């Protein structure tokens, strides 16, 4: 078995190898990459996402989210308070202010320590989940706005024809902005490209051990667990590496820098934070191997997680028994 310790693998494709996205994903899996839950892909040196970022300040963040924490430093929840709209120019200036900027630090490790020590005492503002793309239309390789769609994957593998569309989303981050422990909707893959700015640190649990993280989360967030049988779908819970180590949960960590892709694999729980002002683009995708994970994915039926138009069809076709009760939560 390849990659039996479930380490995060890093790939350096040549420009020739960067032409066929599906094939490269299948290659990475042939080497065991999926066992980690997360892989890094460093694009060929010749490749670029776009020519410059010189005119991005005019993008609107219509609903910036202030991430307010509750709990203790290693075990907390976050709630997202909606703020008034601001442009990326406004947001970047805010990120760089004395109140919100990255503190002085020695290296990524010292900054990681400062994040876990101090996150809960601050409320950074995240411009998340903005439909759009920063890839130039002429970028032909690994352009997250030109991938094969999940609906088309389901049609090719299963023959069924469904409504829905699949488009990317932009994320504008600042110091301490946080993504809580989650898997993707319907346990899909994700791919995330860091267009610009400061790094993003990731933590991940191998898919084969995801249920160990779930059991810990039920112990650490016991009222959330009683409220919903899949409350990590709410994307609100944080658990630090120290706490994971104390409880014997297998995990890995890696820092993504500007110009790099990350791939998350089906049922790979992940969480993380941004080091400073940055912009990432991400989208879900499927392969044939995903189909069985889609059939088995948990669902939030308490109604909090409240998910997309396109996820309806996935549930209807892959989880017809759940269909009914899941759409009662989503209506």
Ligand X SMILES: O=C(O)CNC(=O)C(=O)O
- Binding-site residue positions for Zn(2+): 228, 234, 300, 302
Residues recorded for the chain: 331
Q: Which is nearer to ligand X, 24 or 181 (CB)?
A: 181
The single residue among 16, 51, 54, 58 that binds Mg ion, judged by CB under 5 A, is 58
Distances in whole angstroms, Cα of residue 44 to Cα of each of 143, 178, 241? 14, 29, 32
Residue 176 interacts, among ligand X, Ni ion, Mg ion, none and using kind-specific CB cut-offs from 5 to 8 Å, with none
* Interface with ligand X, residue 8, by CB under 6 A: no
* Partner whose binding site includes residue 264, from ligand X, Mg ion, Zn ion, none (CB under 5 to 8 Å by kind): ligand X
First to last CA, the chain: 44
Take residue 110 and report the two structure tokens written for it. Answer: 């010292």
3-state SS track over 137-175: CCCCCCCCCCCCCHHHHHHHHHCCCCCCCCCCEEEEECC
Q: Which residue is nearest to Ni ion (CB)?
A: 190
Looking at the DSSP bridge assignments, the partners of residue 189 are: 285
CB 296, min distance to Zn ion, A = 18
Handedness of CA 110, 111, 115, 118 (dihedral sign): positive
Segment 183 to 202, residues that bind Ni ion, using CB under 5 A? 190
Residues within the annotated binding site?
Answer: 126, 182, 184, 192, 200, 228, 234-235, 270, 300, 302
Say whether residue 192 binds ligand X (CB under 6 A).
yes
304 binds, among ligand X, Mg ion, Zn ion, none (CB under 5 to 8 A by kind): Zn ion
Alpha carbon distance 115, 276 (integer Å): 11
Question: Segment 267-296, which members bind ligand X (CB under 6 A)?
Answer: 270, 280, 282
192 binds, among ligand X, Zn ion, Ni ion, none (CB under 5 to 8 A by kind): ligand X
> In this structure, are residues 271 and 179 in contact, taking their beta carbons and an 8 Å threshold?
yes
With CB under 6 A as the contact rule, the residue among 67, 143, 151, 190 that binds ligand X is: 190
Q: Residue 77: helix, strand or coil by DSSP?
A: strand
Task: Examine residue 179 and tell whether it contacts ligand X (CB under 6 A).
Answer: yes
- From CA 312, how far away is CA 316, in angstroms rounded? 6
Which is closer to Ni ion, CB of 100 or CB of 265?
A: 265
Using CB under 5 A as the binding criterion, the count of chain residues that bind Zn ion stands at 4
Nearer to Ni ion, 133 or 190 (CB): 190
DSSP code for 242: H
Q: Is residue 54 a contact point for Mg ion (CB under 5 A)?
A: no
138 CB-contact burial (10 Å; exposed 0-12 / middle 13-18 / buried 19+)? exposed
Return the closest-CA partner of residue 267 out of 206, 330, 315.
206
Cβ nearer to Ni ion, comparing 86 with 256: 256
| Least Cβ distance, residue 238 to Zn ion (angstroms) | 17
Residues near Zn ion (CB under 5 A) are 228, 300, 302, 304
Residues near ligand X (CB under 6 A) are 171, 179, 190, 192, 264, 270, 280, 282
Residues near Ni ion (CB under 5 A) are 190
């Amino acid at each position: 078995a390849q990659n039996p310790n479930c380490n995060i693998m890093i790939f350096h494709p040549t420009k020739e190898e960067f032409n066929d996205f599906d094939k490269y994903i299948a290659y990475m899996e042939s080497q065991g990459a999926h066992r980690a839950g997360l892989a890094k892909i460093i694009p060929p040196k010749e490749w670029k996402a776009r020519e410059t970022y010189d005119n991005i300040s005019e993008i609107l963040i219509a609903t910036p989210l202030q991430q307010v924490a509750s709990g203790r430093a290693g075990v907390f929840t976050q709630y997202h308070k909606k703020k008034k709209a601001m442009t990326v120019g406004e947001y970047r200036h805010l990120a760089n202010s004395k109140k919100y900027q990255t503190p002085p630090h020695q290296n990524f490790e010292d900054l990681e320590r400062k994040y876990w020590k101090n996150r809960i005492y601050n409320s950074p503002i995240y411009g998340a989940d903005i439909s759009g793309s920063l890839f130039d239309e002429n970028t032909k390789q690994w352009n997250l706005g030109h991938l094969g769609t999940i609906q088309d994957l389901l049609e090719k593998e299963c023959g069924v024809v469904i409504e829905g569309v699949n488009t990317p989303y932009l994320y504008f981050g600042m110091w301490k902005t946080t993504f809580a422990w989650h898997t993707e909707d319907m346990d899909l893959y994700s791919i995330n490209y860091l267009h610009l700015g400061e790094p993003k640190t990731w933590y991940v649990v191998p898919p084969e051990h995801g249920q160990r993280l779930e059991r810990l989360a039920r112990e650490l967030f016991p009222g959330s667990s009683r409220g919903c049988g899949a409350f990590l779908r709410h994307k609100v819970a944080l658990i630090s590496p120290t706490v994971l180590k104390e409880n014997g949960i297998p995990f890995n960590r890696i820092t993504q820098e500007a110009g790099e892709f990350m791939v998350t694999f089906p049922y790979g729980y992940h969480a993380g934070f941004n080091h400073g002002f940055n912009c990432a683009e991400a989208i879900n995708f499927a392969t044939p191997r995903w189909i069985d994970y889609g059939k088995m994915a948990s669902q939030c039926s308490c109604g909090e997680a409240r998910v997309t138009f396109s996820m309806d069809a996935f549930v209807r076709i892959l989880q017809p028994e759940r269909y009914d009760l899941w759409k009662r939560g989503q209506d």
